[PDB]
Structures are given as C-alpha cells and as structure tokens.
Amino acid sequence: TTAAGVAVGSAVGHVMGSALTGAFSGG
Amino acid sequence: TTAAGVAVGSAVGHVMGSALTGAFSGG
Amino acid sequence: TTAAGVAVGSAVGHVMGSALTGAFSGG
Amino acid sequence: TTAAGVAVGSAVGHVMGSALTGAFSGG
Amino acid sequence: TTAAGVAVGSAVGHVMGSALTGAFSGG
Amino acid sequence: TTAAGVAVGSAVGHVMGSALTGAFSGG
Amino acid sequence: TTAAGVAVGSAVGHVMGSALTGAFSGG
Amino acid sequence: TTAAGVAVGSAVGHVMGSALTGAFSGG
Amino acid sequence: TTAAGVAVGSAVGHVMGSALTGAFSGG
Amino acid sequence: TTAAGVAVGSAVGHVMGSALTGAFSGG
Amino acid sequence: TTAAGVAVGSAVGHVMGSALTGAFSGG
Amino acid sequence: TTAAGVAVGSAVGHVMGSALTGAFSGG
Amino acid sequence: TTAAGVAVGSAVGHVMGSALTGAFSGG
Amino acid sequence: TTAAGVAVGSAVGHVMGSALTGAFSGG
Amino acid sequence: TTAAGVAVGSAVGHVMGSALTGAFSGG
Amino acid sequence: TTAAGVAVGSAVGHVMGSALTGAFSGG
Amino acid sequence: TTAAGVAVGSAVGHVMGSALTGAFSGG
Amino acid sequence: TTAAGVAVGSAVGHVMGSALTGAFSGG
Amino acid sequence: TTAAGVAVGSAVGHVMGSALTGAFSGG
Amino acid sequence: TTAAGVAVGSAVGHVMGSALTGAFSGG
Amino acid sequence: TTAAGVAVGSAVGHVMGSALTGAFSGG
Amino acid sequence: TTAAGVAVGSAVGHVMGSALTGAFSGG
Amino acid sequence: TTAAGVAVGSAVGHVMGSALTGAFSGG
Amino acid sequence: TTAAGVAVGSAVGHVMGSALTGAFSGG
Amino acid sequence: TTAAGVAVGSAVGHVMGSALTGAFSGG
Amino acid sequence: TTAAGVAVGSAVGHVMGSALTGAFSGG
Amino acid sequence: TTAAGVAVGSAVGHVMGSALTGAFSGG
Amino acid sequence: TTAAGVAVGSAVGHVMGSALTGAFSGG
Amino acid sequence: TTAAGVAVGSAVGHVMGSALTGAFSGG
Amino acid sequence: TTAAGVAVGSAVGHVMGSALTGAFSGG
Amino acid sequence: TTAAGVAVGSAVGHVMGSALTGAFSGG
Amino acid sequence: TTAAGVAVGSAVGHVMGSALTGAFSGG
Amino acid sequence: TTAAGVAVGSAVGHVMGSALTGAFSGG
Amino acid sequence: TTAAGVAVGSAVGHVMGSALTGAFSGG
Amino acid sequence: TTAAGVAVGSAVGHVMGSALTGAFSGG
Amino acid sequence: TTAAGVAVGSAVGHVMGSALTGAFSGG
C-alpha cells in the first residue's frame, strides 16, 4: 500500500492538540 | 491500494483538536 | 508499505501539544 | 516498508509538547 | 524497513518538551 | 533496518527539555 | 541496522536539559 | 549495527545539563 | 558495532554539567 | 498593509517553473 | 489593506508554469 | 508592511526552476 | 516591514534550479 | 525590517543549483 | 535589520552547487 | 543589522560545490 | 553588525569544494 | 562587528578542497 | 514499417513535462 | 523496422521532465 | 530494427530531470 | 538492431538530473 | 546489436546528477 | 554487441555526481 | 562484446563524485 | 570481450571522489 | 578479456580521493 | 538588438549548399 | 546585441558545403 | 556582444566541407 | 564581447574539410 | 572578450582536414 | 582575453591532417 | 590573455599528421 | 599570458607525425 | 608567461616521429 500527502496547518494562528499527518499507510 | 491527497487548514484562524491527514491508505 | 508526506505547522503562531508527523508507515 | 516525509513546525511561534516526526516506519 | 525524514522546529520561538525525531524505524 | 534524518531546533529561541534525535533505528 | 542523522539545536538561544542525538541504532 | 551522526549545540547561548551524543550504537 | 560522530557545544556561551560524547558504542 | 496566505502545489506530480508565494504585501 | 487566502494546485498531476499565490495585497 | 505565509511544493515529484517564497514584503 | 513564512519542497523527488525562500522582506 | 522563515528542501531527492534562504531582510 | 532562519537541504540525496544560507541581512 | 540562522545539508548524500552559510550580515 | 549561525554539512557523504561558513559579518 | 559560528563537515566521508570557516568578521 | 519526422518545441518559452519524439515506429 | 527523426527542444527556455527521443523503433 | 536520431536540448536555459535519448532501438 | 544518435543539452544553462543518451539499442 | 552515438552536455552551465551515455547496446 | 560513443561534460562549469560513460556494452 | 568510447569532463570547473568511464563492456 | 576507451577529467578544476576508468572489461 | 585505456586527471588543480585506473580487466 | 531562433534542416534527405543560421543579429 | 539559436542539419543524409551557425551576433 | 548556440551535423551520414560553428560573435 | 556555443558534427559519417568552431569572438 | 565552446567530431567515421576549435577569442 | 574549450575527435575512426585545438586565445 | 582547453583525438583509430593543441595563447 | 590544457591522442591506434602540445603560450 | 599541460600518446600502439610536449612557454 502506497500513501502520498501534504498536511499544512495555519499561517498566522496557532495549532493546538492537532494531529497533522502528511501520509498514513497502515499494514 | 493507492492514496493521494492534500489537506489544508485555515489561513488566518487557528486549528484546534483537528485531524488533518493528507492521505490515508488502510491495509 | 510506502509513505511520503510533508507536515507544516504555523508560520506566526505557536505549536502546542501537537503531533506533526511527516509520514507514518505501520507494519 | 518504506517511509519518506517532512515535518515542519512554526516559523515564529513556539513548539510545546509536540511530536514532530519526519517519517515513521513500523515493523 | 527504511526511513528518511527531516524534522525542523521553530525559527524564532523556543522548543519546550518536544520530541523532534528526523526518522524512526522500528524493528 | 535503516534510518536517515535531520533534526533542527530553533534559530533564536532556546531549547529546553527536548529530545532532538536525528535518526532512531531500533532492533 | 543502520542509522544516519543530523541533530542541530538553536543558533542564538540556549539548550537546557535536551537529548540531542545525531543517530541511534539499537540492537 | 552501524551508527553515524553529528550533534551540534548552540552557537551563542550556553549548554546546560544536556546529553550531546554524536552517535549511539547499542549492542 | 561501529559508531562515528561529532559533538560540538557552544561557540560563545559556556558548557555546564554537560555530557558531550562524540560517539558511544556499547558491547 | 497585511497579507496572510497558504500556497500548496501538487502532492504527486512535479512543480516546474512555478511561482509559489504564500503571501505578497507590496509597499 | 488586508488579504487572506489559500491556493492549492493539483493532487496527482503536475504544476507547470503556474503562479500559485495564497494572497496578494498591493500598496 | 507585514507578511506571513507557507509555501510547499510537491511530495513525490521534483521541483525544477521554481521560486518557492514563503512570504515577500517589499519596501 | 515584517515577514514570516515556511517553504517546503518535495518529499521524494529532487529540487533543481529552484529558489526556496522561507520569507523575504525588502527595504 | 524583520524577517523570519524556514526553508526545507527535499527529504529523499537531491538539491541542485538551488538557493535555499531561510529569511532575507534587505536594507 | 534583523534576520532569523533555518535552511535544510536533503536527507538522502546530495547537494550540488547550492547556496544554503540560514539568514541574510544586508546593510 | 542582526542575522541568525541554521544551514544543514544532506544526511546521506554528498555536498559538492555548495555554499552552506548559517547566517550572512552585510554592512 | 552582529551575526550568529550554524553550518552543518553531511553526516555520511563527503564535502567537496564547499564554503561552509557558520556566520559572516561584513564591514 | 561581531561574529560567532560553528562549521562542521562530514562525519564519515572526506573533506576535499573545502573552506570550513567557523566565523568571519571583516573590517 | 518506416517512420521519419521532426519534432521542434518552443523557441523562447520552456518545455515542461512534454514528450517530444521525432519519429516512432512500433513493431 | 526503420526509424529516422530529429527532436529539438527550446532555444531560450528550459526543458523540464521531458522525453526528447530522436527516433524510436520497437521490436 | 534500426534507429537514427538527434536530440538537442536548450541553448541558454538549463535541462532538469530530462531524458534526452538520441535514438532508442528495443529488442 | 542498429542505433545512431546525437544528444546535446544546453549551451548556457545547467543540466540537472537528466539522462542524455546518444543512442540506445536494446537486446 | 550495434550502437553509435554522441552525448554532449552543457557548454557553460554545470552537469549535476546526469547520466551522459554516448551509446548503450544491451545483450 | 558493439558500442561506440563520446561523452563530454561541461567546458566551464563543474561536474558533480555524474556518470559520464563513453560507451556501455552489456553481456 | 566490443566497446569503444571517450569520456571528457569539464575544461574549467571541477569534477566531484563523478564516474567518468571511457568504455564499459560487461560479460 | 574487448574494451577501448579514453577518460579525461578537467583541465583547470580539481577532480574529487571520481572514478576515471579508461576502459572496463568484465568477465 | 582485453582492456586498453588512458586516464588523465587535471592539469592545474589537485586530485583528491580519486581512483584513476587506466584499464581494468576482471576475471 | 536581440535575436532568438531555431533552424532545422531535413530528417532523411541531405543538406547541400545551404545556410542554416539559428539566429542573426546585425549591428 | 544578443543572439541565441539552434541549428540542426539532417538525421540520415549528409551535409555538404553548408554553413550551420547556431547563432551570429555582428558588431 | 553575446552569442550562444548549438550546431549539430548528421547522425549517420558524413560531413564534407562544412563550417559547423556553435556560436560566432564578431567585434 | 562574449561568445558561447556547441558545435557537433556527425555521429556515424565522416567529417571532411569542415570548420567546426564551438564559439568565435572577434576583437 | 570571452569565449566558451565545445567542438565534437564524429563518433564512428574519420576526421580529415578539419579545424575543430573548441573556442576562439581574437584580440 | 579568455578562452575555454574541449575538442574531441573520433572514437573509432582515425584522425588525419586535423588541427584539434582545445582553445585558442590570440593577442 | 588566458587560454584553457582540452584536445582529445580518437579512441580506436590512429592520429596522422594532426596538430592536437590543448590551448594556444598568442602574444 | 596564461595557458592550460590537456592533449590526448589515441587509445589503441598509433600516433604518426603529430604535434601533441598540452598548452602553448607565446610571448 | 606561464604554461601547464599534459601530453599523453597511445596506450597500445606505437609513437613514430611525434613531438609530444607537455607544455611550451616561449619568450
């Protein structure tokens, strides 16, 4: 299984308690 | 299984308790 | 299993209690 | 299993209690 | 299992209690 | 198992109680 | 198991109670 | 098991109570 | 087991109570 | 004048001869 | 003058000769 | 004049002849 | 004039002849 | 004039003929 | 004029003919 | 004029004909 | 004029014909 | 004019025809 | 099967992601 | 099967990600 | 199977990630 | 199978990550 | 199988990560 | 299988990480 | 299998990490 | 198997980490 | 197996860490 | 005065007594 | 005065008594 | 006055009594 | 006056009584 | 006056009574 | 006046009565 | 006046009555 | 006046009545 | 006047009536 991604949060505000995963590939 | 994606949050406001995954590919 | 990703937080605000993973590949 | 990634936090604000992993590849 | 990554924190603010791992490859 | 990474902290602020590991490869 | 990495702290601020490991390879 | 790394602290600020290991290779 | 590393502290500030090991290779 | 933005390219394909500016604020 | 925006290209195809600006604020 | 931004290229493909500026603030 | 930004290239492909500037602030 | 930024290239591919500037602040 | 930045190249591939400047502050 | 930066090259590949400057501050 | 920086090359590959300057402060 | 820096080459590969200057302060 | 051809791209602009084949002769 | 051809790209602009084959003759 | 060809790139601009084959003759 | 060809890159710009083959003749 | 070719790169710019083969003749 | 070729790099710029083979003839 | 070739690098610039083989003839 | 070749490097610049083989003939 | 070759380095610059073999003939 | 052009002759037939100029710019 | 051009003759036939100039720039 | 060009003759046929100039720049 | 060029003759046929000049720059 | 060029003859046929000049720069 | 060039003859055929000059710089 | 060049003859055929000059610099 | 060059004859065939000068610098 | 050069004849065939001068510097 192949995964490809981009995860971008905010540009000015904060990031609190957040799961920013670019790509997930389970097995 | 192949996955491709882009996940973008806000540009000014915050991101709180959010799961921003670019791509998920389970097995 | 292959994973590729980019995870970017904020540009001005802080990052608090956040899991910024570029790519995850379980086994 | 292969993993590739980039994890970038903030540019101005702090990073507090955060797990910034560029790439994870379980076995 | 192969892992490759880059983990970058802040550029101005501090880094407190954070796990900045460039790449993790479990066995 | 092979691991490759880069871990960079802040450029102006301090680094306090932080685990900056360039690459981890368990056995 | 092979490990390769670079761990860089701050450029202006201090480093306090931090584990800066370039590469870890368990057995 | 092979390990290779570079660990660099600050350039202006101090280093206090910190474990700067270039490379660790357990057995 | 083979280990190779470089550990560099500060360039202006002091180094206090710090374990600067270039490379560790346990047996 | 204040500007805030996020510019994200592709997730799989390349980026060729492109001006990806997150935010522009002329004077 | 204030500007806020998000510009996202493709998710699979390439980006060629394109001006992806998140936000522009002239003076 | 204040500028804040994030510019992210591709996640798998290359970046060729591209001007990736996070934020521009002219004077 | 203040500028803040993040510029991230690819995660797998190369970067050729590209100007990756995190933030530009002219005078 | 103040500038703050982060510039990150690739994680697997090379970087050829590229100007990776974290922050530029002209006078 | 004040400048602060982080410039990181590749993690696996080479760096050829590239100008990696962490921060530039002209006068 | 003040400058602060971090410039990191590759972690596995070579560095050829490259200008890796942590911070530049002209006068 | 004040300059502060860190310049780190590769961790495994060579460094050929490269100008690795930690900080430059012209007059 | 004040300069402070750290310049570190490779950890395994050679250094050939390279100018590794920790800090330069012209007059 | 015989094939003869001439394929010419642009004279001023670039060529991006293009398959310029002078002649193709399948079997 | 016989093939004959000429493939010419640009005269001023670049060539990016392009397959310039003068002649192809499959079997 | 016989193949004959000429493949010419640019005259001023660069050539990035391009497959310039004068002639291909499969079997 | 016979192959004959000429592959010419640029005259002023660089050649990055390109496969310049004068002639290929598979078997 | 017979192969004949000429592969010429640039005349002013560099050649980076490129496979310049005059002629290839597989078996 | 017979191979004949000429591979010429640059005339002014450098050659970095490049495979310049005049002729290859596999068996 | 017979091979004949000429491989020429640069005339002014350097040659770094390059495999300049005049002719290769596998068995 | 017969091999014949000429491998010439630079005329002014250096040769670093390069494999200049005039002719290779495997068995 | 027969091999014949000429390997010539630079005429002005140095030769560092280079394998200059006139001809190699394995068995 | 600026000139840019491409001049291509035949692909199969000969070229006899012909002035093939890519670009002419008189003074 | 600036000139840029590409002049390509035939691919199969001969070139007899022909002036193939890539670019001419008189003074 | 500046000139840049590429002049390529035939790929199979001969070149007889021909003036193949890559670039001419009179004074 | 500046001149830059590439002049390439045939790939299979001969070159007889021909003036192959890469670049000419009169005074 | 500056001149830069590459002049390449044939790859299989002979060179008879030919003036192959890489670059000419009159005074 | 500066001159730089590369002149390469044939790879298989002979060179008879030919003036192969790499670079000429008159005075 | 400065001259730099490389002149290479054949790789298999002979060289008869030929003036192979690497660089000429008249006075 | 400065001259630098490399002159290489054949690799298999003879050299008869030939003037192989690496560099000439008249006065 | 300064001269530097390398003159190499054949590797297998003879050298008859030939003037092999590494460097000539007239007065």
Q: What topology emerges from the helices and strands here?
A:
36 copies of one chain form a homo-oligomer.
Chain A (H helix, E strand, L loop, with lengths): L1 E7 L6 E2 L2 E3 L2 E2 L2
Protein name (chains A, B, C, D, E, F, G, H, I, J, K, L, M, N, O, P, Q, R, S, T, U, V, W, X, Y, Z, AA, AB, AC, AD, AE, AF, AG, AH, AI, AJ): Coiled-coil-helix-coiled-coil-helix domain-containing protein 10, mitochondrial
Organism (chains A, B, C, D, E, F, G, H, I, J, K, L, M, N, O, P, Q, R, S, T, U, V, W, X, Y, Z, AA, AB, AC, AD, AE, AF, AG, AH, AI, AJ): Homo sapiens (Human)
Function (chains A, B, C, D, E, F, G, H, I, J, K, L, M, N, O, P, Q, R, S, T, U, V, W, X, Y, Z, AA, AB, AC, AD, AE, AF, AG, AH, AI, AJ): May be involved in the maintenance of mitochondrial organization and mitochondrial cristae structure.
Report on the structure:
Chains A, B, C, D, E, F, G, H, I, J, K, L, M, N, O, P, Q, R, S, T, U, V, W, X, Y, Z, AA, AB, AC, AD, AE, AF, AG, AH, AI, AJ: It is found in: Mitochondrion intermembrane space. Chains A, B, C, D, E, F, G, H, I, J, K, L, M, N, O, P, Q, R, S, T, U, V, W, X, Y, Z, AA, AB, AC, AD, AE, AF, AG, AH, AI, AJ: This is Coiled-coil-helix-coiled-coil-helix domain-containing protein 10, mitochondrial. Chains A, B, C, D, E, F, G, H, I, J, K, L, M, N, O, P, Q, R, S, T, U, V, W, X, Y, Z, AA, AB, AC, AD, AE, AF, AG, AH, AI, AJ: May be involved in the maintenance of mitochondrial organization and mitochondrial cristae structure. The PDB classes it as protein fibril. The entry lists the keywords chchd10, Amyloid Fibril, protein fibril. The assembly is 36-meric. 36 copies of one chain form a homo-oligomer. Chain A is an all-beta fold and 27 residues long. The first copy, chain A, is built from no helices and 4 strands. Chain A has strands at residues 2-8, 15-16, 19-21, 24-25. Chain A is elongated, with a radius of gyration of 12 Å. Chain A starts with a strand and ends with a strand.
